[PDB]
Amino acid sequence: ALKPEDKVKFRQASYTTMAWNMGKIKAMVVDGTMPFSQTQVSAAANVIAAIANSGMGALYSPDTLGVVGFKKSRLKENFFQEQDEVRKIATNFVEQANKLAEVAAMGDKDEIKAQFGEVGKACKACHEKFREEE
Amino acid sequence: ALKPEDKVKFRQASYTTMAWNMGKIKAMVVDGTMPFSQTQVSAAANVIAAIANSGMGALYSPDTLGVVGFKKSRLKENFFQEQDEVRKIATNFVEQANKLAEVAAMGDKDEIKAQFGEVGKACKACHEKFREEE
Ligand code: HEC
Ligand code: HEC
């Protein structure tokens, strides 16, 4: 298997990778601080959908509590008590991530904007329950 | 724009994310230390193709030399002198990553194994020239 420190590293890396690509979509379709490119918005959405489907469940085990990956894990222990809540939030995120990739393929800015907001809410929902605010 | 420390963080995260997914393909089709699942091999290949197409070129600027992202950047300065070599290696990696995703979709273990070896060589080619060995 993976050691705990690998699980933390790989999940921190995965989330950081998604944040870079979320930021590019935000810049092009929400803030307009970057010219809208279909191929780049699509490419960024595809990373988010791909990581969402990569089975990150395997990187969550109680032996990762308090472990340093890149940094000390910010996973809260309540993650392991609230499995109904974890499933609800994770399955919503996967569903929204897929939809974002589907609409970013052909969509205009308004459609992508709507789908992007649903993914952002899904990221935030998990953070609000299961990530330490520092 | 992004600060240098963000560029290093995002590129380290991106490569670490790809290494997790490479490791899963290796386990299932090379070492057989994990039972072969089509959907999981495909899901892992799709992450690699998606990150390969995410325009990581934007995360390489000379102001990132020696900068801490998660860790001190291991980018070598010769990256900025050997642009012909960078282009050759990067375009090969993108091409091999796409092919891996295409064959992992329907492929058997032998086809994926062949495509996986081409991606692994492409990762290594860039490391050999432009990443400090520590
Ligand atoms: C639970 C189902 C989550 C979903 C969906 C997303 N994130 Fe998250 N994130 C989560 C946890 C439990 C943690 C802490 C991981 C750890 O072990 O430390 C995180 C962390 C991040 C980070 C910080 C990464 C780091 O380098 O320390 C970022 C930038 C982040 N997450 C972003 C992010 C985005 C953009 C998401 C949707 C696209 C997203 N996360 C979803 C839990 C969950
Ligand atoms: C150049 C075109 C590259 C290709 C293709 C790949 N990698 Fe790489 N990698 C590269 C550099 C310049 C660096 C250092 C980045 C920095 O600023 O430190 C890396 C680093 C890695 C790492 C370490 C990440 C960390 O957390 O410090 C890993 C695990 C890694 N790279 C893996 C990897 C894999 C699996 C690739 C193909 C699928 C791959 N890299 C390609 C340059 C390049």
Author numbering:
A (entry chain D), B (entry chain D): 2 to 135
Paper text:
Here, the current status of the fully automated ambient-temperature beamline VMXi at Diamond Light Source is described, and a highly efficient pipeline from protein sample to final multi-crystal data analysis and structure determination is shown. The VMXi beamline and its associated PXF within the Research Complex at Harwell offer a highly automated pipeline where researchers provide a suitable protein sample that is used for robotic crystallization, monitoring and subsequent in situ data collection from crystals in crystallization plates or in thin-film sample delivery systems. Here we present illustrative examples of data measured using VMXi from a variety of proteins comprising both conventional crystallographic standards and ‘real world’ user samples. Routine RT data collection provides a useful capability that is highly relevant to studying protein dynamics and ligand binding without the complication of cryo-cooling.
Other users tend to focus on groups of proteins with homologous functions from a range of microorganisms. This is the case of a group working with cytochromes c′. Furthermore, they pose a challenge as their heme centre is very sensitive to radiation, and thus careful data collection and analysis are crucial. For the α-helical cytochrome c′ protein from H. thermoluteolus (PHCP), a total of two plates were set up yielding one crystal hit for the PHCP protein under the 96 screening conditions. A structure at 1.88 Å resolution was determined from four data wedges, each of 60°, measured at different positions on a single larger crystal. Notably, because of the high-symmetry space group (P6222), a single 60° wedge gave a 2.08 Å dataset with 99.4% complete­ness, but adding the three further wedges within xia2.multiplex increased completeness to 100% and led to a significant improvement in dataset resolution. In this case, only a single crystal was required for RT structure determination because of the high-symmetry crystal form and the ability to measure data from multiple positions along the crystal. The overall RT PHCP structure showed a four-helix bundle, superimposing well with the cryo-structure having an RMSD value of 0.38 Å.
